[PDB]
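User: Modeling request: complex.
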Amino acid sequence: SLIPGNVDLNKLTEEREKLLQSQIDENLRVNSLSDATLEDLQKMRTILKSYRKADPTNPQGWIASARLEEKARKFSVAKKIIENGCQPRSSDIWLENIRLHESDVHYCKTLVATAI
Amino acid sequence: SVLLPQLRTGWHVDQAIVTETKRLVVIRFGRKNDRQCMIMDELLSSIAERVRNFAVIYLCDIDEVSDFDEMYELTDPMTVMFFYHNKHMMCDFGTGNNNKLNFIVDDKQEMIDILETIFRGARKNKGLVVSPYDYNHKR
Amino acid sequence: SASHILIPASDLSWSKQTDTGITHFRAGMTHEDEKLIPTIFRYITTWENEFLDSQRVWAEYATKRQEAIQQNRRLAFEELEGSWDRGIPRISTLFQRDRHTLAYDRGHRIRREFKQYSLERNSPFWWTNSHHDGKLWNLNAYRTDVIQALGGIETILEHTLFKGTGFNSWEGLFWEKASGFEDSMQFKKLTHAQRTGLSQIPNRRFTLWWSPTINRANVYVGFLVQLDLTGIFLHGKIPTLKISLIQIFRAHLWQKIHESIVFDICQILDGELDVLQIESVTKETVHPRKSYKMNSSAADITMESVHEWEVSKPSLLHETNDSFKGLITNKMWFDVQLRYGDYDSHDISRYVRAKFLDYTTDNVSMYPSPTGVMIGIDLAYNMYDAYGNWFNGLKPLIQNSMRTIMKANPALYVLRERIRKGLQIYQSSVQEPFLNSSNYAELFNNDIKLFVDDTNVYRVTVHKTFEGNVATKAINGCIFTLNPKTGHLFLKIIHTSVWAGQKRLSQLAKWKTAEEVSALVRSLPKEEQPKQIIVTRKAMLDPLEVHMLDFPNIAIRPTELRLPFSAAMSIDKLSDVVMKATEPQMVLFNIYDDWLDRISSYTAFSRLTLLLRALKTNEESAKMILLSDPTITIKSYHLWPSFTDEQWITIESQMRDLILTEYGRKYNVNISALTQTEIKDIILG
Amino acid sequence: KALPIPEDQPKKKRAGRKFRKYKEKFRLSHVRQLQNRMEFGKQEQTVLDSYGEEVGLGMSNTSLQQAVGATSGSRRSAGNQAKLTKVMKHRISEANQQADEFLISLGHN
Amino acid sequence: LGLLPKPEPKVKLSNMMSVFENDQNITDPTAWEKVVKDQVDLRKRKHLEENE
Amino acid sequence: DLKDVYASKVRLNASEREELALIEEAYDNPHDTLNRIKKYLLTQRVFKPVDITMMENYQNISPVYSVDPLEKITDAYLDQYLWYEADQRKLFPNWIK
Amino acid sequence: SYNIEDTILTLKESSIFDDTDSTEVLENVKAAEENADREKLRLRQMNKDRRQKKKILNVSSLDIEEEEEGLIIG
Amino acid sequence: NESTADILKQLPHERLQAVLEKIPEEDLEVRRLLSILKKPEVVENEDVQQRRIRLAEILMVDEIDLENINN
RNA sequence: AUCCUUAUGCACGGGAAAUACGCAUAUCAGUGAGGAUUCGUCCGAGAUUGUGUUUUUGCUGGUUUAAUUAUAA
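Assistant: Request completed. Predicted assembly structure:
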């Protein structure tokens, strides 16, 4: 349990005060870790690239390669990938692309109208 | 100093080496008046009770017995030497002289480790042992 | 480093061997500002720039927060993804998940200053909590700049024994840390001397790794000493590397290598007597000390001719232009000289030409004729060459042969392992422990577990007809996952229509199965969620992890045992459910019928192993063991028919009989001679 | 008192359900072993210790988990969990039981 | 001294899986179940017999 | 803040392992440890001896005090409490650095 | 689409990224473990014969190399 | 055959068990030897078998002679 | 005769620990050891000293090819 990377305070507090209150009622990511190395993240890129090349359809892959690279890197990469594989029926690539890529009103509307 | 017995003839030395089969024989060759000879006498005097099982320590004076002077080439105020089954033992300390011993050891534990390692390597007939501590900054 | 330190141009020289030849690289001939080792003074920003960036950063954050709420919106990361590391409180600290409970932590800057008196550790950072302040420096670039300053990974590996380890590429390799190695030795009861004796091992690995640089004529000067039975020279005492080189060559290994390659070139030429018109090939007698003696050497293999040969100018293997009109002479010889090289000269060319000329011109040496071939090999850098007198059909032979000779020989293969035990460098693919025969008994602990086998996902049936050939029809597959305890099945039935419009149908299978396992595990509450998911195919290890990142508590294992779940489609009720399904579906089963009421789950699973293993083999004739008595009725509920206990006790023997007879019959092995652990090993896999 | 003797003794072995449960305290577990593996060629995962000194966990996280930064749950050994000495365990329980009658005395009053 | 037979390992339904000394553990699953269970019932039988 | 001392350690000395048992039970039984701490505050006036060592900075040799871990729990809680309430009530002025 | 042979054929084990774009094969379940157990058996009996009878193998370059050596529309 | 029953005889459990059978079995006779020897007539909870074993033990420790010589 | 309470012995079944269990031609100790307190008092059997072993005691399991003999001459 002393592996140091796991500890976060929120889950420990809401995990704790509920056990406290239960006992009373019965009585009645870390900032510390180094950022991912380009070559590991590159391994991720190759695997996910194989998985998106596995299915051109099945948007689940596109959304997955979008959100995982998002948590990893994001910025341009994800926002380009999503727009790439978004080329139509499935609404989810649009619900995701809208959320991430927008940052400004006009372009929000441009993505919304395409989904419509 | 009073704790350790002294050897007053060459035959007490030789028989002390011969009559003891199962544990190392450790002799300090030196004289009572010397500065370096009393220090290793105190160090070895504290260690004797711990080690009595696998080694025994004796004392020899050069003026009392001058017979071994030429044979083992005794110089410097003191030389500690290690004997197992009449066989002179040998260990490379880094001092460049794998024979005998010269300098004053500092800590009890470091000398007990020398005794222990020389003993353990001596049970296997191994002539040369390698100390865990190369002190050669001393010699 | 804080200091001025330059890499001299002699350190950067690095060579690489390819099947075409040996290429060299030196950057020193370029004359410019000499390459320096970087220092921190570049990589730490001044306080001024950090505070002066802090005011403007917090200003920008305030403005952006006002613009977000001004739009009735919350801050998007992409806005602040421009500046994270900038500003002293470190804006990243605003997005930490634990911040909500850090606000109640007050007075910490004082607590750290007072940790001096509660405990004995020097705390070189008493002025920062990486929780409150954040990470105030990144030295990551110092590393890449150090790697490039030294010339790259390659120019570094020329300074090591890496090429001796025999690895082709360094990608999949890892080190066994000596820190932890020192911990596992201190759980035994040991004397203080036994204790200090184990702290010199990591130094000893380090001295091996850098040995080709640490041992060279320029570093220690001194006088050469020769390790007794080897060709290794020690310039300094170097007490550790002496010991380690002695433990690398054991039981006259240097001689076994020379004798080995000689045997090899022998057995390559001896069969070629015909093609090259050779009357005889005779490997000569060996003065047993010849391999490791340096000054003088004598020919090993001798070669004769049907008439005579056409020699050429003495040259090297990989050279092209050849002229055989130079001479016509009779018979040939070969030396094979092993060399253990320093970083000074690792080049085998110059060594082979210098030794060739010296020996051929030496009076003390002994050679059958003045026509011969020297073949040198560096065992540290795994290199080779020949400076020969050449004839038609040698270089295209000797090259192709030496290619195999360096990568084959058990001698070299023994070097490479004796070395990489000393370096404790390893290869790995899967870090997780496999299921073994000895590991089997852990399956039945209290951890909830699952078995997932994809061998049935995409299937094709070939039928025999009279006229054309091979009637083939795609069929509904199934993902077969069971937990062994509750005996409960999850089958995702994969319909044929799912395969209609795609190509490269192989990888789609493994990824679809990964997805279906993710959906299946997410369907289960955290009460029912497994811990170890166990998969037969190794190719399913990567595609599961991708989908399982959301569940870090669940662990995934492969198996060395082949589990008999591919035969699960031989059960009639199951296969009927699979053939009639018109849609992808999910159907629950209990394979154990009711076996758990009368009998524990362990023996219920281990009888299932028998039932299925025999269905892999004789199939329907293993079914005639089951269906013998029609008075024994399979209900609509169950799969297997209802028996009493003893009826099963006999049936299990009959089922074991098919396994033990067909294993031997196929492999020509007698049943009776088998040891008990060999029978259980045959049943498991 | 004397050091017993340096002579090594022949090793004796037993592995039970009881005794493996004993030595579970004394062995490096699987996850703890993966900290001891340094992958050749690239930097470790290191996490800042409370004193700020980087604590490397080398292989403990799958090659994909460095990219995502999700660390791992993996398999936690519950056998090496820290537990109390016989002297401390009764002192705690005693302190709590008397604290209970204290909280009751304040409860009715 | 040899005057008393060497003791055989106690096998329970928990320990049942991990005892490989006997023949029938994995190869015959159900007869090994019967062996173990009858061993247990036999020990409890010895207890009750002693009491009576 | 008592726990983080042991996070960088692969191995545990006998005492450190005891203290980890203390922190772990303090998590597992929070109500019980709250009651125990509060009664220690109202009640316990007598404590077990503190042990001295000395750090060498090679210049300044400074005392280092090791207390018993039960007492360390109440001291940690009381410390955190006093600082939270003290700064929440704006006790220390600007010039206490 | 490439085959190896009222019989059923399944996909042979292949690594995702190492396979990448490559020809895929269809083999029989019993035939794969059949061939594997024949070869590995031949290795086991040669193990017992080598270690028992203490014979040293000729092998070397060509032998070990040759040991390294070891369509349907639907 | 000698070293087999010698180790077996040298052992304290067997050495007591051989004395156990030669002391007579009744309440009043067991009790009478104890009362004469001055040791406790009765202890808290014992079946007369256990009392008899206390005869054997007490005879063993003191190395006192048999009830023959006792009386 | 049934049923119940306490203590002790043997024992089936279920846990936890082995920084834990012991030993003493040895010093004391309900004729008061060792503690607690809200300052009125309250609890009531070990404490010292030396020593043996203590990542361990005993026992086990796995892995590292029989003889005989047949042709038409």
